[PDB]
Amino acid sequence: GRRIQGQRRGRGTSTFRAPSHRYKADLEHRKVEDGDVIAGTVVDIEHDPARSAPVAAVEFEDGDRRLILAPEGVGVGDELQVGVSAEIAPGNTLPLAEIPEGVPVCNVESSPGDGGKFARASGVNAQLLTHDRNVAVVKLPSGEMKRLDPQCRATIGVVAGGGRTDKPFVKAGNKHHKMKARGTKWPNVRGVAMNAVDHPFGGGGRQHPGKPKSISRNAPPGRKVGDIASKRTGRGG
RNA sequence: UUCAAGGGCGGGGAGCCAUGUGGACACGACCCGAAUCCGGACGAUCUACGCAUGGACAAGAUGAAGCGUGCCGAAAGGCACGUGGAAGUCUGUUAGAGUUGGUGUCCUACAAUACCCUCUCGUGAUCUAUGUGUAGGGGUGAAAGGCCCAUCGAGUCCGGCA
RNA sequence: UGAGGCGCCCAAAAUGAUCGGGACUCAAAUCCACCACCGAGACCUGUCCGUACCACUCAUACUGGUAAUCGAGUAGAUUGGCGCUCUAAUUGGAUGGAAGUAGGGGUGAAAACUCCUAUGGACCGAUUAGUGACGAAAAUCCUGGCCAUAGUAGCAGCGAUAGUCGGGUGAGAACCCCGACGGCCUAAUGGAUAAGGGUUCCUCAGCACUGCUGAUCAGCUGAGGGUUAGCCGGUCCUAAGUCAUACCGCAACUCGACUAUGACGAAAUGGGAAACGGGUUAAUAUUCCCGUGCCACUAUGCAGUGAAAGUUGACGCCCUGGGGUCGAUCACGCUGGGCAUCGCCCAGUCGAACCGUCCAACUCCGUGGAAGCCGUAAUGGCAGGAAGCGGACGAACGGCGGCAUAGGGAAACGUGAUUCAACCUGGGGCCCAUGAAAAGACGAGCAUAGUGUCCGUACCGAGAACCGACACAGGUGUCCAUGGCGGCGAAAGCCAAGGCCUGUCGGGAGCAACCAACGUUAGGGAAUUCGGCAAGUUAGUCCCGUACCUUCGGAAGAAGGGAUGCCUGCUCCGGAACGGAGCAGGUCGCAGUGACUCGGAAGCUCGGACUGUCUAGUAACAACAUAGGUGACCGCAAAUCCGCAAGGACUCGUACGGUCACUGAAUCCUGCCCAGUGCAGGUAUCUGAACACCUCGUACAAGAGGACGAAGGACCUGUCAACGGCGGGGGUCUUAAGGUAGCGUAGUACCUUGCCGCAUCAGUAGCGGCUUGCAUGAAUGGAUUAACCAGAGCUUCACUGUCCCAACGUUGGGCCCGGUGAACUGUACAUUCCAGUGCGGAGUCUGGAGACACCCAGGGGGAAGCGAAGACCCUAUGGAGCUUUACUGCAGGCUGUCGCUGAGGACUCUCACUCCGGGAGGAGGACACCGAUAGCCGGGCAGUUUGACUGGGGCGGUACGCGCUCGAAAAGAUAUCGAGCGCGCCCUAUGGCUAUCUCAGCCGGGGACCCGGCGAAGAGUGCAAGAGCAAAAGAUAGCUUGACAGUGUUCUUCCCAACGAGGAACGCUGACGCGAAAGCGUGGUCUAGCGAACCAAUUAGCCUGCUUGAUGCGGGCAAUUGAUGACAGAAAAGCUACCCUAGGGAUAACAGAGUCGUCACUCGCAAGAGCACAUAUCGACCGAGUGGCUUGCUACCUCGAUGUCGGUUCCCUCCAUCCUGCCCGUGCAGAAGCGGGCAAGGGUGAGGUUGUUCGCCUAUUAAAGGAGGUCGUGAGCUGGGUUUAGACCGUCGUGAGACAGGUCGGCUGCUAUCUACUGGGUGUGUAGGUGUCUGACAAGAACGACCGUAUAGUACGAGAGGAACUACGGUUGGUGGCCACUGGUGUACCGGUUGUUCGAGAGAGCACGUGCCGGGUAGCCA
């Protein structure tokens, strides 16, 4: 047949790329020499096109003006700290080691100095549970217990924008505007609604997948559609 | 070949070459005739979708939240009037976009998709110009096997090829 | 009373009857005899030719001879000859005229040869041997040329109907120019431009070309000329993004991703230093010239030490205040014009950049001191300091002054105001959406001077300059969005400025038919139709008023009702408007939203929630999307995806994420099933590859086996909002469960027009209910639902030419004339008609009939008309797209192993390598990544296959390999999807021999046993059938292994007649068994029980392997076993309605033709009953027929096409008669029924469901008959059904997909040549004229039917009931004609009146061929 939509994606053509030339900044933690002698002042709160959440512009002591992944409760004028000796206050960044157990953090680094990888979406937060000399245990938004190098930096507090998901889009037009700010092809035509040549589920008088939807992990691209390697399906049992 | 026998093939000198001609096989194989398949190229001046930078939307209707005033209330609030001006909101041949019916006109046409009346949309998932990107078993597709320069259930050109 | 001959009745069909026709009756019939004739290419006969044979001969050269026993021919075989080109040898012709061509003479059976004459003006032969791009009637053959078509179609149709009278120029004027009059265009038909074009621009001179006619004209032809820039674009900047170089990949590159660098990337329309006004030319113009001004850089001078922080460039959508120019309008003045019953109407009244100055808003400061005040259109503001007062900063493309005794104007050369586009500046609101960047500029003075180069510059910008082959009704961006009236308006309509008469052929006919657009139609009012399709109705604004239902938004403009102008004088709101809302009085019309503009309304049901999307070019929908619901994967060194790789999208993203899927708003809900399939997890044991390891084997190696065992599978578990499933049976069974809530005859229900009800005169429709559901049912989502809809169906009110039933009118065509001027199509002939025949669907054949030639107009019956090598169907060892547990492979994923890879069946470490980090360093780590290989998964991808037979194909079946009987016609051979029926083995005895013996069955004596008798065979002999067999071929007993090895002959397979395996009969040789021996035994009495090559295993001996020997392991001769049943041998599944090609009437669908079982109709016989009575009437059985209306059968015609059903319109016919006329019978009193006969003149109608045909139903009727004409009628109409592509449901299928099952949508080309006919002409014939006739023939339905009255309340009859003859009056259908009457029309005409323009008035134009309304003459009509 013809390559399915999931295969057109990988080519990274315009239709599938994110509007990067419109994105603001890479909200990675600042790189400090050591000591924590780095402080800045929240100079402004801005909208972040790539995450539908707010971001804060900070002016650091040494003269660096950088956008920051802002937690909830940060406002203009407030002073933020980034370093091993930073104060344990919402909005400050420091290694997990320096963080008191039982404190919600966000923008947690995967590997020390990478800039942050976990808990960066609207209103989410990781939960630092255990400390140690070799391993800091964090509970991520998905609820999974993650073991991290205690040298991994994080920001105290939860991410700004919480509850963004509580309000329904109501209209296709609203979904539309948001989708235009992402790297996604939208709207979505059902596989069952296409011709056999276009999808494993296409074809047949009435619409229906002429096959079970749970597909093997080993399936090749073009065939791996439907419920990928499902451990189970439905709501029952 | 055969204990044995019986079979098979060959045996008392005619061939070799040349020229014409009958016929066979591979090759285009008496000549034309068709839908393919493959290779390398050329096309996004059409069109599909995305992106960049610009542009367009008379007038009218309806009257959301919010706010106000008055009365009622212990309060919560309620009611009335006003204000306000929301909306993939209504009417609209505004610009602009489209095309339900006439199965009208035309059907060697004005036109290889046109004409007229009726009809639908017209502040938005809107329409539109230019630039720009995606290329052939590949694009693009709110999916009709639609569209990729009058051609697409696999473009076009030349070649494979007689 | 029997028999025979001829005839009669039985006896009905569709355009015109037939024996070929005429026509025939003591025959021109039939039968019995006879007589004489005609009539082939036969037969006889003369001459000649060919061929064969004979004699003579070198001869196949002559000559002679023979043919009763020779003379036709498609495919094909054989052989002699004609012509063409060039070569060679030999030999000729030609300027005293070659070849060729044209006409003509001669020869040859013919191919073809030759001569004469004319033309021509230079080459041309013959013989012989060669050479070959050597011969055309044909291929929808190719190219060129040409005729008919035809002086034909077009030069009309579009909301842009456009001209006319004079004159000018010229050889020539409808369309070239001037004037007048008349018109057209207003977001365009005007002005400026982008792309694109490229000289189209201007001038002069032209008209052969181009131009829908003409042309003096031009976008055409000839010749010249024309585009002038510091300040308008380019140039500069960067955008999405592109390229180049470096680096890396790649076999490689002109290929490819990242990362660096550099460059490229915006001409209307992104950012951006600076120019305005006027004048000038045939054509340029912010470019030239005049005046005035400005910017940048540089130099000099003065000033200045500031200089980079900040600001700007620089920004979304929606609402809105304020400032404010142009425009427009109002008031008054000035200048000029127009009009002249008034006193009005029009135009103008100007003046830039720039320099200078003014500042509202915003922000902030001082003062002040609000505890309730300040403020807005609105929000709002304040002791964190309100108002008020003062102040800093601070705007216009704006005001003001200069510019300006610049410019411009004939002149005047204004002044104020309102509403205010541009432009300036604020306030508010929205985002799961956040609305560029960079160069540059400001920051940062002034004088004077110098420099400011390079490229573009014309013109069109479109119903003739662009793209569409065109001077194409198409397509094509920007701005002019503020000209006047109008009105809500950037709407309509009318009119300016400006443009045009080129959406470019004209002339003529009261101008016919017919067609395209359109106006008006009495009464009825959807009767029309599949369907109100088409048309119409309603309409603007204000007031009153407004249901069910509802998600409380809506429904809603629901519905329904009323008002509407003008004039006079006023009130209210507001600062006011040339803004708005009202009042009082007066008054006109048919009509006051007067034209124009401008909704018809209501209810029920189905679907999809909604806005949105889509098949460019037959589908706009119920399909796609959607928010909402849900499930799946993934912690980021991730999941998913692209790349061979280098690398990459997602991703400046991180679970409130984003990937993969399903369902499809809300609301109420979403049951049972984990057996199969899918996914996932687990797994003692089982199974499970390669490397390494072990055993055997090999001096080694091949190889055989073993141990170990990953993923995977077995096995267990989880999982259905995972594929899917939820039946039959009984009061469980398959295969897990056995259908719960709901809904239900459904867009799903075959039966089916289900049944009841509603509604209608009548309702296959629709709605409600019932419901056992052929075959509903829960995210394959169920139910339900307000709102929405060019979605499907139904009903009602209103309205109407849809209809009854048509008419009249308008505009453009049509017709005639001038000019211009195609195409389609053409084997030939062609004046046809009725029958027949023929490959069964004829203008051309046969027989008749008719027919004087030509032309004009017409509507289209026929030419199975033209257009397209049928899209249907089948066939082909065709193609393609699609599917899958088809065949075979390939990517990809998982997994083991080896290399990378290091040190000390579980472990530590660091040093390769990986990742994080700017770095130090951290994390990990011999793993991972990568290379190689092995096992598993693997329609994600590729190549293929998927057979044949067949009363078409499919399904079914196998007549696909074998044996028997019959078919089979007495040798042999012989078909069908012919009839009956078998074989794919079985048997160590059920084989072989020998000995002894005789069987079924019946009878007699003591179903077992014993004895006797009869008994040619009916028994038995493995299994079909047919055949064979009795001291046996059977039975019993005993013995035995011949069911043996080798090798042939022959026949069969395969008649004749070639073909393999297989088989049989008969031999020779060897070895045996039994018998006294002859002899028997090559399996079972005979005919079925079967399998190639390649390969393997096996048996015995031998041959052989690359210089040589040995060993291993191979190659071969002969043969046995292993299978191909599609059985003389491929390894092999489907869909296509998205389809494509080659062909086929070799094969189907409709139709024709044949048949006539079926169907319709009739007849013979007459049982039976009809109270008695066969026959008033009904009528079984059985028998005999006719038709060609039903159906089936066949495959004869057609696949280079003969368009389906139904309807409609229009014409002809048949009779088997429904009515009407005339009769006969009756179980006929009458009236009326019932049955029958003659008879085809006429009639046979309107409606409800349904596409229907049919049929059911309703009211009428004399009756409301049936059938043929290609199931008459699409070059006539329709397009509802059927029958393409889109989509849904039920059922089927793993799936693609399928289903005379249902459902919504879905294209109808052509200018008539011939013929035919309706009408109209011109000629010829009869044979200069006028007028009047005849009547062969021809057409008619010209008339059909009914009601009523008198007869008569009579005849008849107890009564009830109730006729006729005849004479009358009227109605209806049909027919022909006419307009006094009634009615319609009446774009003659007269009137009323709305908007607008001409100043008013008067009088007029436009508002589509009347703006609208009223009346209406002639004429035409019903």
Ligand SMILES: CSC[S@](=O)C[C@H](CO)NC(=O)/C=C/c1c(C)[nH]c(=O)[nH]c1=O
């Ligand atoms: C020129 S061919 C005309 S068609 O054959 C006309 C005939 C009329 O009987 N129609 C049919 O035969 C229709 C057959 C159909 C069949 C077999 N199957 C279907 O599903 N639908 C049909 O219409």
Ligand SMILES: [Cl-]
């Ligand atoms: Cl989202």
Ligand SMILES: [Cl-]
């Ligand atoms: Cl000859």
Ligand SMILES: [Cl-]
């Ligand atoms: Cl320019």
Ligand SMILES: [Cl-]
């Ligand atoms: Cl304001």
Ligand SMILES: [K+]
């Ligand atoms: K055919």
Ligand SMILES: [Mg+2]
């Ligand atoms: Mg970041």
Ligand SMILES: [Mg+2]
């Ligand atoms: Mg996008």
Ligand SMILES: [Mg+2]
């Ligand atoms: Mg979807």
Ligand SMILES: [Mg+2]
């Ligand atoms: Mg589809």
Ligand SMILES: [Mg+2]
């Ligand atoms: Mg597929």
Ligand SMILES: [Mg+2]
């Ligand atoms: Mg383009």
Ligand SMILES: [Mg+2]
């Ligand atoms: Mg209001």
Ligand SMILES: [Mg+2]
């Ligand atoms: Mg574009």
Ligand SMILES: [Mg+2]
């Ligand atoms: Mg010679």
Ligand SMILES: [Mg+2]
């Ligand atoms: Mg020739």
